[PDB]
Design a protein around this ligand. Structure first.
Ligand SMILES: *[C@@H]1O[C@H](CO)[C@@H](O)[C@H](O)[C@H]1NC(C)=O
Ligand SMILES: *[C@@H]1O[C@H](CO)[C@@H](O)[C@H](O)[C@H]1NC(C)=O
Ligand SMILES: *[C@@H]1O[C@H](CO)[C@@H](O)[C@H](O)[C@H]1NC(C)=O
Ligand SMILES: *[C@@H]1O[C@H](CO)[C@@H](O)[C@H](O)[C@H]1NC(C)=O
Ligand SMILES: *[C@@H]1O[C@H](CO)[C@@H](O)[C@H](O)[C@H]1NC(C)=O
Ligand SMILES: *[C@@H]1O[C@H](CO)[C@@H](O)[C@H](O)[C@H]1NC(C)=O
Ligand SMILES: *[C@@H]1O[C@H](CO)[C@@H](O)[C@H](O)[C@H]1NC(C)=O
Lengths: 469, 50, 475, 100, 50
């Protein structure tokens, strides 16, 4: 019935107000139309926010609050959670300081941010690893708020999966500014893919130690969490490229899109509440005072945030306030220090990949390597067979090699997606046997021009032509 | 017709943390079958008649 | 070199006594120059007025820390969350008096919170130490659906997993549910005979009331009850045999405040020699930035050591809380509390008073009663398990082998029809063969009570793929 | 030999009794199970026969939970029964019978 | 292969050179003055194990 929205000074005021007014008028006409109370102020202080909350409470009993932000401070999220707990007013989290979520939702609070928990980030990283066929893990962590339960969750997820990940133990750093035990801890790392659960400040020192120990090679890979990569525009020179990270930064959805989604979710929740109970919610005597006892006779909005669908999208929330289908775009640090989207996660909680494997080289130092060499094979003899990956979250069960094949789409277009394929046979076994003796990486491709071929017009075709060229 | 079809095993130590690895390694070797060549080139019973 | 330290206190008497204490402390120990000009504020019941007063009287008064004390009324909550949240904007450290709740233990919710009161993780460590010194193997845990309970359970699991030991059964409670009979009987039908509770006073009372109903206060049972679960009506509703806990010099508000101010009076000098100090703004309005010296303040506070405290040396963990706190075990004897087990830290100091146990036992019960009730599951195998239907009398027909010896038979329980999608009935079958003979031999040798059961699906059971295939569960 | 699952999965039955009944009724040309069970079935019913020498040789056992304190006391009893001649007597009285 | 150190007082390439060492028995052809620093580097990297 009465919804207010708070915005920063990034854009203009009149256009934002007009868009917020037009939002609910697009479709889904509620029986009780919601108003718009939009304020744009650069000041971000707790007293200003509580005064604004009091004013909107006096503003025809505002029922919902939307707060935008432009900074990266996490204290504003904590104070908003406190306000929601002491006011029983649903508040949504938008881009800005409240983007990162780290505090557990209070049982008496009604808060639903647009962020995602580390557990969802953990399974997104696991799906990315499954796509990359990286079955070797290296878990290095540090004493950080809530990281122990993250380690427990990732362990109880990897051991419960049919992939069969590596049994490498967790190498947790003791304390910062050691310079003696850090090398001892890094000695125990003997893997190829390393997962990092670290802070932004300690990331610089750990990457400096890795550069000193030469852990930024072609074979080695690095995974960076969302909190470290929160400041996309802040790329220090000491960070090597290739730091794959997952976040939901404003690369595909803007502030206007986020506020549209928020107002749509609020309208759907209000409509569901009205359909369930015909009772307009009311505020307390004061903003969040305790003159009388705190009681809420009406039912909480937590059950109403389960069956929520807006414009055909199931943008609901779980019991902990986490998004059921978050964005979770994957950003990869380019060679020239830029972040680009290489996949999404909204497709029914699945993982999407652009299929670009080789993107790493000597960034921290200057030493080229040729450890990745492409291999081309055919399927005309009973020695190489390629099979489609089974749709059971497994990479061709066991005893397989990743493969690439250009599957033609139309009779005219020659565009082929890099679909992963099985690899079995006598030649595959010979290559696997040679792998131990050569300790070398493999990139397996297929011939895109019929059979092996021969010299035609003084030009070789097939595998011979690929080798020559 | 062996009276006691026992075996040899590996003599561990009481409380030694190797019962979670040695048995698994032995079972993996048995399942993958790495003892056939050993028993053919180390037992090789000559006296066989049919 | 003039600094200020804030303080939120229940009454003006505490405010003036602590002001006198800090004024005296400014001239004690080293007393190089002028140290502290403290300012005190009261716990305003109105949250908005309290927050505004705190902002005006602390942010604009050049303060570096806030001394938040316990609420005057124990029954009411008066959560110190708002002041910690306000201090978190500039990474302002805050000193907790007796906030034992594990809400502030995690730094994610409150980045800047350094309390001198040990959390319930220390209580879990004390329970682990008691288990180690008493050699308990079968241990179960009862944790309610609260953040502090989850934190305590996680701490106990982390501290116990290092000794290749895991809790046999963990159950979840709710704040208000009274039908805990199912969970209580589930705990009863277990080998472990030790029950530990960790919840609010009302939840502890309503879960211990059913203990007398289900005869859980008898002999052979050991109860591990936390510090806050013995107070209130628990003393009246709990008979003898309760092994509670208490913190020595934990409720001493004056002593805790004196220790905190003595710590800060030297911490300020240990931090003021840096290159620069980020002064707070001259008012609640005007500045929205964040101090860059917050981590430095946290490090200098956690790394500092003070042996002048009442409890001894003062050191902080990774969460900046009390380490090696002094614990006193309280034993409920004749509806009275007797101090017997006093533990300085990482050391056991037994006392001459006898430790009573529920049921009147004068000796420590081992708590290892398997009751010889080993459930047996059998798979229908023709050469080894001969399954035949039973007669109307409940016993199968008796036959003899080739040598005339009486063939033993065991009453079998399982589904009537093995076909899927059928009205399965748990009629009594009659399975006999090779395995039952050795089972009877084991029963007659090492006192086993065998009860053979069948399998509905008739499969040995391996890893299977189903809906939500990320869950690898054996069938 | 990964091509086996392209045929094995499409012909899995529900029980060993059903499988042996189908084999007797000329449904399945072959069946895979433990050597002792097949040998006993062939000895009891002359219409069946066991082929092949041996492959993937293994043994039986008794499974208990990792926290059960009845491991050594059961292993010692099993070894005592094995060395006291009980196992051979049980095999004679339950496996050794008339041979076709 | 022979992993020859370039020059003394580097503190950056020494760890890179020591990374390539993945053996159990190591032969040292070094001087007395540089022995102290190379042993300190080995202790920091934990190469003095059993
Ligand atoms: C000293 O503290 C008193 C209250 O305790 C306060 O009124 C006064 O402004 C303070 N003076 C300075 C210089 O901070
Ligand atoms: C508790 O629930 C059980 C259901 O298993 C029921 O049999 C019992 O009567 C209930 N007791 C009370 C006091 O409600
Ligand atoms: C044990 O509990 C039952 C109720 O479950 C009660 O009937 C019985 O009297 C109790 N036994 C004793 C000795 O009090
Ligand atoms: C606190 O301790 C002091 C001495 O350590 C004592 O004199 C005082 O009575 C105690 N306060 C309380 C409330 O027990
Ligand atoms: C703990 O030890 C210190 C020094 O050893 C001692 O002064 C103190 O009294 C001890 N605590 C108790 C409760 O005895
Ligand atoms: C254990 O078995 C022996 C064998 O005779 C018997 O005397 C004894 O009573 C049994 N004890 C229990 C507790 O079953
Ligand atoms: C195993 O047997 C011994 C005596 O042979 C007995 O002392 C011990 O208690 C038994 N183990 C268990 C778990 O009962």
């Amino acid at each position: 019935l009465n919804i207010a929205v708070m915005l920063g000074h990034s854009h203009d005021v009149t256009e934002r107000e007009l868009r917020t007014l037009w939002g609910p008028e697009q479709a889904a006409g509620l029986p009780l139309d919601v108003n718009v109370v939009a304020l744009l102020m650069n000041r971000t202080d707790p007293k200003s926010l509580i005064t604004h909350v009091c004013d909107l409470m006096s503003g025809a009993r505002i029922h919902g609050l939307v707060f935008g932000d432009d900074t990266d401070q996490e204290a504003v999220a904590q104070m908003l959670d406190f306000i929601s707990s002491h006011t029983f007013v649903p508040i949504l989290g938008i881009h800005g300081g409240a983007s990162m979520i780290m505090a557990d939702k209070d049982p008496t609070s009604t808060f639903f941010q647009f962020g995602a928990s580390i557990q969802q980030q953990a399974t997104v990283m696991l799906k990315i690893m499954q796509d990359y066929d990286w079955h070797v893990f290296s878990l290095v962590t540090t004493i950080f708020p809530g990281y122990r339960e993250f380690i427990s969750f990732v362990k109880t997820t990897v051991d419960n999966s049919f992939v069969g990940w590596d049994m490498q133990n967790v190498i947790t750093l003791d304390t910062s500014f050691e310079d003696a035990k850090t090398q001892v801890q890094l000695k125990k790392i003997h893997s190829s893919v390393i997962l990092l659960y670290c802070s932004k400040d300690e990331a610089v020192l750990i990457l400096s130690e890795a550069r000193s120990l030469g852990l930024t090679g072609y074979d080695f890979f690095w995974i960076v969490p969302s909190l470290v990569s929160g400041n996309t525009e802040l790329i220090p020179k000491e960070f090597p490229s290739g730091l794959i990270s997952v976040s939901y930064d404003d690369w595909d959805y803007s502030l206007e899109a986020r506020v549209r989604d928020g107002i749509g979710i609020l309208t759907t929740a209000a409509s569901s509440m009205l359909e369930k109970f015909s009772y307009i919610p009311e505020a307390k005597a004061s903003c969040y005072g305790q003159m009388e006892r705190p009681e809420v006779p009406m039912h909480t909005l937590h059950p109403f945030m389960v069956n929520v669908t807006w414009d055909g999208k199931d943008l609901s929330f779980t019991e902990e306030g986490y998004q059921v289908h978050p964005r979770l775009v994957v950003i990869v640090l380019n060679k020239d220090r830029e972040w680009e989207k290489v996949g999404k996660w909204e497709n029914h909680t699945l993982s999407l990949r652009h299929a670009v494997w080789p993107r790493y080289k000597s960034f921290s130092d200057c030493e080229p390597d040729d450890n990745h060499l492409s291999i081309v094979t055919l399927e005309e003899a009973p020695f190489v067979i390629v099979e489609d990956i089974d749709p059971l979250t497994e990479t061709c069960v066991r005893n397989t090699v990743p493969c690439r094949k250009f599957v033609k789409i139309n009779n005219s277009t020659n565009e082929g997606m890099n679909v992963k394929k099985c690899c079995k046979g006598f030649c595959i076994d010979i290559l696997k046997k040679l792998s131990r003796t050569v300790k070398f990486t493999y990139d397996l491709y297929l011939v895109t021009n019929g059979k092996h071929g021969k010299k035609v017009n003084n030009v070789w075709n097939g595998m011979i032509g690929e080798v020559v060229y | 017709y062996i009276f006691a079809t026992t075996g040899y095993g590996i003599a561990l130590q009481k409380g030694s943390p190797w019962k979670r690895q040695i048995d698994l390694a032995l079972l993996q070797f048995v399942g993958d079958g790495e003892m056939e060549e050993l028993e053919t080139c180390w037992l090789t019973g000559i006296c066989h008649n049919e | 070199k003039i600094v200020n330290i804030g303080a939120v206190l229940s009454t003006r008497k505490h405010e003036q006594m602590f002001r006198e204490a800090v004024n005296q402390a400014n001239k004690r120990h080293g007393s190089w120059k002028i140290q502290l000009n403290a300012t005190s504020v009261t716990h305003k019941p109105n949250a908005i007025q309290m927050a505004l007063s705190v902002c005006e009287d602390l942010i604009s008064s050049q303060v570096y820390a806030i001394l938040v004390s316990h609420p005057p009324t124990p029954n009411d909550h008066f959560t110190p969350t708002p002041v910690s949240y306000t201090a978190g904007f500039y990474r302002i450290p805050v000193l907790g008096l007796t906030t034992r709740m594990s809400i502030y233990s995690d730094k994610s919710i409150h980045l800047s919170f350094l309390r001198t009161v040990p959390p319930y993780s220390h209580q879990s460590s004390v329970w682990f130490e008691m288990m180690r010194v008493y050699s308990w193997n079968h241990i179960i845990l009862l944790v309610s659906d609260d953040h502090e309970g989850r934190a305590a359970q996680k701490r106990l699991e982390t501290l116990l997993e290092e000794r290749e030991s895991k809790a046999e059964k963990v159950l979840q409670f709710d704040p208000g549910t009274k039908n805990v009979t199912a969970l209580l009987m589930e705990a009863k039908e277990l080998e472990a005979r030790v029950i530990i509770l960790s919840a609010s006073e009302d939840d502890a009372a309503t879960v211990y009331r059913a203990a007398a109903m289900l005869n859980m206060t008898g002999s052979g049972y050991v109860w591990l009850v936390g510090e806050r679960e013995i107070s209130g009506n628990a003393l009246r509703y709990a008979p003898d045999g309760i092994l509670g806990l208490q913190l020595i010099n934990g409720k001493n508000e004056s002593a805790h405040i004196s220790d905190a101010v003595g710590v800060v009076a030297q911490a300020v000098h240990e931090l003021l020699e840096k290159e620069n100090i980020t002064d707070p703004p001259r008012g609640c309005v005007g500045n929205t930035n964040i101090w860059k010296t917050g981590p430095l303040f946290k490090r200098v506070l956690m790394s500092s050591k003070y042996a002048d405290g009442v409890t001894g040396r003062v050191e902080f963990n990774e969460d900046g809380d009390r380490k090696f706190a002094n614990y006193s075990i309280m034993n409920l004897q004749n509806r009275k509390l007797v101090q017997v087990g006093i533990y300085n830290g990482t050391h056991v100091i037994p006392n001459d008073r006898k430790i009573i146990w529920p049921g009147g036992e004068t000796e420590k019960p081992r708590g290892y009663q398997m009751s010889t009730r080993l459930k047996i599951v059998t798979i229908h195998q023709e050469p080894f398990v001969y399954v035949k239907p039973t007669l109307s009398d409940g016993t199968c027909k008796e036959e003899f082998t080739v040598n005339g010896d009486p063939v033993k038979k065991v009453i079998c329980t399982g589904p009537n029809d093995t076909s899927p999608g059928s009205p399965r009935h748990t009629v009594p079958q009659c399975c006999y063969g090779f395995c039952i003979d050795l089972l009877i031999k084991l029963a007659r040798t090492m006192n086993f009570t065998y009860e053979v059961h069948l399998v509905a699906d008739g499969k040995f059971g391996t890893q299977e793929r189903v809906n939500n295939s990320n869950k690898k569960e054996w069938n | 030999l990964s091509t086996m699952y392209r045929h094995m999965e499409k012909h899995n039955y529900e029980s060993a009794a059903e499988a042996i009944q189908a084999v007797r009724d000329n449904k399945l040309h072959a069946f895979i199970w433990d050597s002792a069970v097949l040998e006993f079935e062939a000895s009891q019913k002359c219409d069946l026969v066991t082929t092949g020498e041996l492959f993937f040789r293994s043994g039986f056992g008794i499974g208990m939970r990792k926290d059960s304190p009845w491991k050594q006391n059961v292993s010692l009893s099993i070894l005592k029964s094995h060395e006291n001649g009980f196992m051979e007597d049980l095999d004679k009285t339950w496996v050794r019978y008339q041979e076709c």
